[PDB]
Design a protein around this ligand. Structure first.
Ligand SMILES: Nc1nc2c([nH]c(=O)n2[C@H]2C[C@H](O)[C@@H](COP(=O)(O)OP(=O)(O)OP(=O)(O)O)O2)c(=O)[nH]1
Ligand SMILES: OC[C@H]1O[C@@](CO)(O[C@H]2O[C@H](CO)[C@@H](O)[C@H](O)[C@H]2O)[C@@H](O)[C@@H]1O
Ligand SMILES: [Mn+2]
Ligand SMILES: [Mn+2]
Ligand SMILES: [Mn+2]
Length: 129
């Protein structure tokens, strides 16, 4: 079974809203809401990966961020380790830089059912902030 390391960014503005994108219909976890992020490549660290992935996907450079949660999840056909970075400072304005839907969502209104099931404990912990 495939094993992947994934770094994602929880992008939180001053109004307690999170920048959330929606995954393509032909992707793994198709049509799900998601924190922007992606695969950690050989020769880069988890910290470097979340910077690169947010630059690619939404056009911001995260800075002074922290590891909010790290967890493992077994999907039906792949095992993934997810690094959830809390990003409260960044350069740029996030947008759908890869043509994907993206918008600001109130933290209190997030519904874990809309996200991959791996995100359930993270969404709960976020609402506890
Ligand atoms: N990006 C992201 N992926 C998540 C989340 N929760 C979750 O289980 N996943 C899973 C879905 C995928 O199996 C994997 C993310 O890989 P990805 O498809 O974003 O990887 P990528 O951006 O590097 O891929 P690509 O655009 O090059 O095709 O992790 C999340 O909140 N954000
Ligand atoms: O690992 C994140 C953790 O480390 C601290 C310093 O103790 O932040 C450092 O690492 C971040 C990720 O690379 C950087 O963004 C930050 O600038 C750097 O100081 C903590 O702030 C954070 O919890
Ligand atoms: Mn990507
Ligand atoms: Mn991605
Ligand atoms: Mn990638």
């Amino acid at each position: 079974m495939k094993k992947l390391q994934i770094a994602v960014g929880i992008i939180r503005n001053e109004n307690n809203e999170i920048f959330i994108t929606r995954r393509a219909a032909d992707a793994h976890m198709a049509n799900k809401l998601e924190f922007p992020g992606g695969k950690i490549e050989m020769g880069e660290t988890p910290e470097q990966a979340v910077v690169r992935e947010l630059q690619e996907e939404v056009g911001i450079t995260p800075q002074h961020f922290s590891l909010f949660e790290k967890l493992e999840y077994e999907f039906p056909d792949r095992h993934i380790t997810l690094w959830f970075w809390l990003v409260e400072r960044w350069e740029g304005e996030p947008w759908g830089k890869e043509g994907q839907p993206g918008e600001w969502m109130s933290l209190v209104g997030l519904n874990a059912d809309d996200f991959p099931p791996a995100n359930e404990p993270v969404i709960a912990k976020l609402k506890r902030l």
